[PDB]
Structure 1
Amino acid sequence: AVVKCKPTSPGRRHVVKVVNPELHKGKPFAPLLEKNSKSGGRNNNGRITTRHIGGGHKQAYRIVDFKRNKDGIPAVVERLEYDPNRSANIALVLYKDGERRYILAPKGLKAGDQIQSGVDAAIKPGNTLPMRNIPVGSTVHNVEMKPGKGGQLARSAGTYVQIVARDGAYVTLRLRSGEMRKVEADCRATLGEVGNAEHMLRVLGKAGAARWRGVRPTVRGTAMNPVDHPHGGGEGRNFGKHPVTPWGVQTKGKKTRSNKRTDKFIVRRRS
C-alpha cells in the first residue's frame, strides 16, 4: 500500500511510504547472509571515484539465487522478505530436498506458492526456463545475458522484459529501457514481472531520508568557483557555458556508448 504521512512536522508533510504487510517481520535467514561494508564511493586508491556516496544504514547482504539452476525440484515460498540491498523484495523458498534459497520476488508471489525451474517447468510466474522454452510474447524478468551466467536484466522493482521474437539461436527482447536486444535463446528468464511495482511511488520527504540511504548531497557546478568545475564562477548567478560534467564533457545529449564488441546484439537503441 502507498501511505501518505500526516503533516505533524514539516519533515513529515510530504513523506509517502510504501508499506507491505506481507513482508516478514523477523530476522533474515542467517545461512544466506554475508557482511557488506560500505565504500564511501572510494576505490582501492582511496580516492572518490563516484561522488555522493557515504553514510547511511548498515546493511547485510542476502545471497540471492539469480541462476535458478536447481532444476526439476519443486520449491515452496516460505515467506517474502525485505532486502536492503535492492528495490525488489525477495522470497525465501524451500526446495523439496530441504535446501533453502532466496529469489527475487515476482509480482503475485506469496507464501505457499510453488515454483520450479528447468526446461519442463510449467509456464507460471516465478518459474525459470531457458527462453527457447518460453512462448514468444511472454513477460519475464531476471533474464540471463549468457547461458548459465545468472540473471542480469530486469531485476529492479516492477521491471520486466518482453520476448518479442525468436529466430534460430537468439531471441529478441524488449528491455525496460526500450532497447531491443538479442540474447542467446538458451539464456534463462523467470516468468512474470519483478514485484514491488509501487516502489517508485514513494516520496522521501526530507533530506535525512536520502542520507539514510547513503546518498550524500549534490553540489551544483554553477555554485562553485572556476578552479573547481567548468560551471564555476561569476559575480552573482552566471552561466554562459554549454553544460558539462565536472570533467568537461557535454552532459545534455552527447552520447557516450562506445562498445563495438556488443554492437551486434543491439537490434534497436532505446530511443
Structure 2
Amino acid sequence: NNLISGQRRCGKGRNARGIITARHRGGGHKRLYRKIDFRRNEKDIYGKIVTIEYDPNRNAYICLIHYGDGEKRYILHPRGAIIGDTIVSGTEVPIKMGNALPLTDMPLGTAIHNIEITLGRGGQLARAAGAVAKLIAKEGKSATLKLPSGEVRLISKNCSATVGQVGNVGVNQKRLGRAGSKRWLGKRPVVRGVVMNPVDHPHGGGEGRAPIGRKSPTTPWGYPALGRRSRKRNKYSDNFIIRRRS
C-alpha cells in the first residue's frame, strides 16, 4: 500500500494569515489520506476488484483495484458491486456497472458518476455516497446531464464518466445520537446569533430573550441569509446551465 499516505494539511480551519476563516473545525480524530484516481486514465488495461474498505475522509466507500499487468489503484465503490468483480477504462468497453468511458459513446439515460466538467482534470461531479447522474440528451459538442441536485447542465461530450450509481446509499440512517459523536467526527459547536452581544453578531444583544428583530435574517456579516441569490451574475458558465434545482 503506497496509496495510504499521512500527509495532512493540519489545523484545517485556518488560512495563510492563521485565522479561523472556515468556522467550527478542530478536535476530530487523527486521519490519513487515501489517494483516489478520479481520472481513471489507465486506458485499455483490464482491472479486477479485490477489497471494499472504509475511507475516513468520505461518505462513500473506497474500492481497491488490481490491474492485469500488475499495479493497484483506489477508486469509488459503485452500488451493486462486490469483491472479485471486474472493470476497465477506455473508449469501447461495455456498460457494465463500474466501468469507465467517455460520455459520447454512452447510452441515453444511464445512472453514472465521477463526471469531469473539463477534459483532462479528473472527476468532480457525483462523488458522494449515493451520487447518481442521468444523461438526458446530447447536442453537437455538448452532452446534457441531470445532476444529483436536480439540475440539468450542458457539459462537454468528450468528458469522462464512470457507469453505475455510487454505493453506501444508507448513510442517512445514522442518528449520531449524542454531542460527542459529532465532536469526534471533526465538527465543533455552533453558537446561535440572537444569543451573542451586539458587538459580535447582527442579531446580538436584546434584553431577555431576543426575537430576530432587524427586519431581515442576517449572516454574521450583514448579507441577508434566508432568501437572496449569490451566483455571481454574468459568470463564465452561465450559458451552459439549463435548469434550477428542486
Which TM bucket (shorter chain)?
A: over 0.9
Distance 1:151 1:190 in 2: 9
Tell me if 1:61 matches 2:33: yes
RMSD: 1.0
Tell me if 1:162 matches 2:137: no
Tell me if 1:79 matches 2:54: no
Tell me if 1:246 matches 2:217: no
Which residue among 107, 116, 124 is the counterpart of 1:152?
124
Distance 1:49 1:37 in 2: 15
Distance 2:221 2:169 in 1: 36
What's the counterpart of residue 8 of structure 1?
A: none
Q: Is the 2:195–2:210 Cα contact (8 Å) retained in structure 1?
A: no
Unaligned runs of 5+ in 1: 1-29
| Higher mean C-alpha displacement, 253-262 vs 136-145 | 253-262
The alpha-carbon deviation at position 72 of structure 1 amounts to: 0.9
Larger helix proportion, structure 1 or 2? 1
The alpha-carbon deviation at position 38 of structure 1 amounts to: 2.8
Tell me if 1:41 matches 2:16: no
The alpha-carbon deviation at position 235 of structure 1 amounts to: 0.8
| Higher mean C-alpha displacement, 34-43 vs 162-171 | 34-43
Q: Aligned with 1:201: secondary structure?
A: coil
What's the counterpart of residue 208 of structure 1?
A: 180
Unaligned runs of 5+ in 2: none
Distance 1:75 1:237 in 2: 62
| Higher mean C-alpha displacement, 31-40 vs 183-192 | 31-40
Amino acid at match of 1:270: R
CA offset digits 1:133-156 (Å, max 9, x no partner): 111111101111111211100000
Tell me if 1:265 matches 2:240: yes
Q: Is the 1:40–1:55 Cα contact (8 Å) retained in structure 2?
A: no
Query: Which stretches of structure 1, 4 residues or longer, exceed 4 Å deviation after superposition?
Result: none
Distance 2:42 2:129 in 1: 24
TM-score by length of 2: 0.96
CA offset digits 1:205-242 (Å, max 9, x no partner): 11111111110100001110000000101111122121
Q: Is the 2:13–2:25 Cα contact (8 Å) retained in structure 1?
A: yes
CA offset digits 1:42-64 (Å, max 9, x no partner): 11110111110111011100010
Q: Aligned with 1:223: secondary structure?
A: coil
The alpha-carbon deviation at position 37 of structure 1 amounts to: 4.0
Q: Is the 1:139–1:192 Cα contact (8 Å) retained in structure 2?
A: yes
- Number of residue-to-residue matches in the alignment: 242
Amino acid at match of 1:265: F
Distance 2:12 2:105 in 1: 43
Q: Aligned with 2:181: secondary structure?
A: helix
Distance 2:130 2:18 in 1: 36
What's the counterpart of residue 31 of structure 1?
A: 2
